[PDB]
């Protein structure tokens, strides 16, 4: 660790890393949903649990790893899921903190 | 419910902004990668669209901005001509070229 | 007209922010992808530049921030060494490496 | 025309984002000005709403977020209780409390 | 002028000043329009020529100084205007660059 | 639950960006309002802090950036002098003035 790491230019960047990562994921989600707009699926694309849930058809389950941005805070290997039903998307259950073992003391 | 969940409501309200920002970012990167050419008409952003740098007599034609795809009644394109006076106005105008309307 | 229209004028004023933000995003993503490895000099941001994680004895060299190209008199690269004491200061310094001044 | 002008179209599409960002900014400033108190339930942002720090037995009640005023069928409020286990879920739920719907 | 002014932390900020100023004006415009939503005026609030045009009634002319963010590029004292009509807002004419004498060589 | 919900978790991660951006915006506005006057030390941004325009012999002192309060061991202020050579370095240095470290 050096004077470089403690410089205020690096501190400003380091403090924004989680934010930049999440915004980047939100942007990709927006672009994805846009590229699929002509298809009209049963469950349109949504964002929750800081995760993009791509458009889906009835009976599909979308499963993804827990958000990578918080990898260092996870106490177990884990994933999150959402089901597309005839009445829309299910709740994301288990949700992020439960599925992922997120912890910050 | 999940559609009306507030995290999704936050995201959905931001989608146009995220999409436009990425398009502007790509435009800035395009103009930057090209800055050692010095063309008649340098790159501009107009009608929510990036217009690559160009020389006199060129016509640049691009598809209508995809961000408003749900409000178009047709797949359209928009153009500008580079002249020795600079860039022309976009033609046809955005609203007509793109078949744009809002209920 | 178009060149001087306010849509373009707002975009041109945002170019710096858009290009640096994209570079910060890339840096954040790079450091996230390399978090499993535990390198001697970790990823840092300094002089508006991402400096990738590195090992003792490496020198990382990158072009001057393209974002300020119009303010350069020279084709410049900047560098840091990863040493046993950590990251070196940037060399040559940003102003000299890049031939920067405001006009 | 002027409504459908692309500069206005850019702005209108950004209004929710600008409004939410200012509300988040005010929340961050509120939490920061209060950080030397150490209350049972520290400040949180939930349901697009800032929840001031609070002590056990308190109920914090605020109006529904004004950013979605055009989609409400009534002026509503939302609440949380601070307990010795932390913050409660918002009540009534956002959709019900606020009379929210989209055509 | 010192090493402070030439530091990359200051250069990053200085390069973003116009942007921050315009975004701030856009935010205030958004808040203004929101605070007026119950009123339903003939011409709803709009943004062009990097200017907020507040909600208005038929027959009103809104006039404002040229955007302050570009004060240093103006070659003459000037203002911009927009009229609210029974068929919506007029075009902003003269527009920014004409009204304001904007120049950048 | 709420404290650990992702809406709050995203907000908490954005706090730094929101607070610094608000401070940068205030700095931009301050410098714009003072542009008629032509001061000896012009407005600058350094060590995540706005340093207002100033005259020879002035010392500008401000509290350590509140944004990093949780990383301070001390109640700190930072200062610069405007001298005939321009702005001084910040004193005491940011790390020492503020009692900063990462935990």
From Swiss-Prot, chains A, E:
Glycans are attached at residues 49, 79, 83. Disulfide bonds join 29-52, 43-84, 66-100. The chain holds residues 26 to 114 of 438 of the full protein. Interacts with ADCYAP1/PACAP (via N-terminal extracellular domain); activated by PACAP27 and CAPAC38 neuropeptides. Interacts with VIP; the interaction results in VIPR1 activation. Belongs to the G-protein coupled receptor 2 family. Residues 17-105 are extracellular. It is found in: Cell membrane. This is Vasoactive intestinal polypeptide receptor 2. G protein-coupled receptor activated by the neuropeptides vasoactive intestinal peptide (VIP) and pituitary adenylate cyclase-activating polypeptide (ADCYAP1/PACAP). Binds VIP and both PACAP27 and PACAP38 bioactive peptides with the following order of potency PACAP38 = VIP > PACAP27. Ligand binding causes a conformation change that triggers signaling via guanine nucleotide-binding proteins (G proteins) and modulates the activity of downstream effectors. Activates cAMP-dependent pathway. May be coupled to phospholipase C. Expressed in CD4+ T-cells, but not in CD8+ T-cells. Expressed in the T-cell lines Jurkat, Peer, MOLT-4, HSB, YT and SUP-T1, but not in the T-cell lines HARRIS and HuT 78.
Curated annotation (Swiss-Prot), chains B, C, D, F:
Residues 15-103 are extracellular. Glycans are attached at residues 47, 77, 81. This is Vasoactive intestinal polypeptide receptor 2. The lineage of its organism: Eukaryota, Metazoa, Chordata, Craniata, Vertebrata. GO terms for molecular function: G protein-coupled peptide receptor activity; G protein-coupled receptor activity; peptide hormone binding; pituitary adenylate cyclase-activating polypeptide receptor activity; vasoactive intestinal polypeptide receptor activity. Interacts with ADCYAP1/PACAP (via N-terminal extracellular domain); activated by PACAP27 and CAPAC38 neuropeptides. Interacts with VIP; the interaction results in VIPR1 activation. Disulfide bonds join 27-50, 41-82, 64-98. G protein-coupled receptor activated by the neuropeptides vasoactive intestinal peptide (VIP) and pituitary adenylate cyclase-activating polypeptide (ADCYAP1/PACAP). Binds VIP and both PACAP27 and PACAP38 bioactive peptides with the following order of potency PACAP38 = VIP > PACAP27. Ligand binding causes a conformation change that triggers signaling via guanine nucleotide-binding proteins (G proteins) and modulates the activity of downstream effectors. Activates cAMP-dependent pathway. May be coupled to phospholipase C. The chain holds residues 26 to 114 of 438 of the full protein. It comes from Homo sapiens.
């Amino acid at each position: 660790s050096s004077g470089v790491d403690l410089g205020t230019e690096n501190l400003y960047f380091q403090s924004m890393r989680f934010h930049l990562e999440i915004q980047e994921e939100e942007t990709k989600c927006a672009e994805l949903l846009r590229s699929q707009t002509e298809k009209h699926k049963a469950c349109s694309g949504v964002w929750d649990n800081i995760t993009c849930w791509r458009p889906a058809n009835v009976g599909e389950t979308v499963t993804v790893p827990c958000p990578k941005v918080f990898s260092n805070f996870y106490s177990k290997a884990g994933n999150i899921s959402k089901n597309c039903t005839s009445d829309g998307w299910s709740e994301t259950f288990p949700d992020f903190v439960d599925a992922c073992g997120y912890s910050d003391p």
